[PDB]
Design the sequence.
């Protein structure tokens, strides 16, 4: 209910900062969040690729 971005994955988020990976949907972070802006969404199922590219989880290697 907040697709105000362009390319897939990168979607609007009210709290940026840290995210998830192909091994940790949620990464610990004493900080809080980055200002509202287009970015990845771990709470949805998106992870960060070694190429620093946010991609769905099913888009991971074997």
Sequence:
């Amino acid at each position: 209910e907040a697709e105000k971005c362009t390319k897939p994955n990168e979607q609007w988020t009210k709290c940026g900062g840290c995210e998830g990976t192909c091994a940790q949907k949620i990464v610990p972070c004493t900080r809080e969040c980055k200002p509202p802006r287009c970015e990845c969404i771990a709470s949805a199922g998106f992870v960060r690729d070694a190429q620093g590219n946010c991609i769905k989880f099913e888009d991971c290697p074997k």
In short: The chain has one domain: 1-62.
